[PDB]
Design a protein around this ligand. Sequence first.
Ligand SMILES: [Cl-]
Lengths: 166, 166
Amino acid sequence: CGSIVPRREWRALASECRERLTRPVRYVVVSHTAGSHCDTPASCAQQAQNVQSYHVRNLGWCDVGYNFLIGEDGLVYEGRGWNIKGAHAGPTWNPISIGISFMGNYMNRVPPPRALRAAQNLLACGVALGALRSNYEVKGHRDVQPTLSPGDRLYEIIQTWSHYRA
Amino acid sequence: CGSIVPRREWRALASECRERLTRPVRYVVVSHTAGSHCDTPASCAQQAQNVQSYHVRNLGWCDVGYNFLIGEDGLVYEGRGWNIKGAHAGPTWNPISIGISFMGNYMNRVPPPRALRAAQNLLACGVALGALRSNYEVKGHRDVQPTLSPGDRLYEIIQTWSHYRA
Ligand SMILES: [Cl-]
């Protein structure tokens, strides 16, 4: 499901994280990377590489912090996946959430419809696989942490999603 | 289920097809367009437009002949959809099948894994929706019509699919 781009396909470094999420997960936190935007499979694969590079080598993390990344190419990029706890929303929310991050800065841009489609489809695939609860709740990154993420315009959109709860 | 680029998004001309398929459909016929390939959302949306233009304007069909198109950008493009009979495999197979076409020429190229993923994912959602049978069968275009489509290399791959039946 999701036609998710797997780790090796975007040339990811090997994970070394061990902490597992306890399925089914009840929460989904939507962020933005506040990094560069990308609109092709080649450029978004490079961008997921860059995001992981910063988390791995500079911040010293066991892997890219997000469970999944959404490109403006309309594709979902595998981060830590469904079963591995992320590092994207702080110690309160990391073990009870799935963190999906839109690659870009969305204070003054909206992501394209195909990016939003990929995100909602990804969440449906998480329900189908048992990784998410049927009644999962979507939160903005700014609703759980002091941050402008996921950006004003993207935040406006996710507030209209049927599973969003402030 | 599934993420599909809708007709209006790739700026399709309005369909005038009326004849319906009978759910659930038993057969899926995999073609290639034998035309240009594309690996970005912008270029693949244009390519779906070009394919439809040739079918509608030159061949005089009611819409693009394919039920769905697959781009090398990794996205699925809505053709006639799940419920409308296509024009892709001749009068014997058109009324009993779903026609999916990889946009490109795959005599000497393989489609990228993300294109293959998009096609397999699309068929799974067809089953989930009830548009396809649980036990649908995948055929190559050359298995039902005299043609090189879907191309030697693509044909080699679909023969390895679990629902393939020569
Ligand atoms: Cl970490």
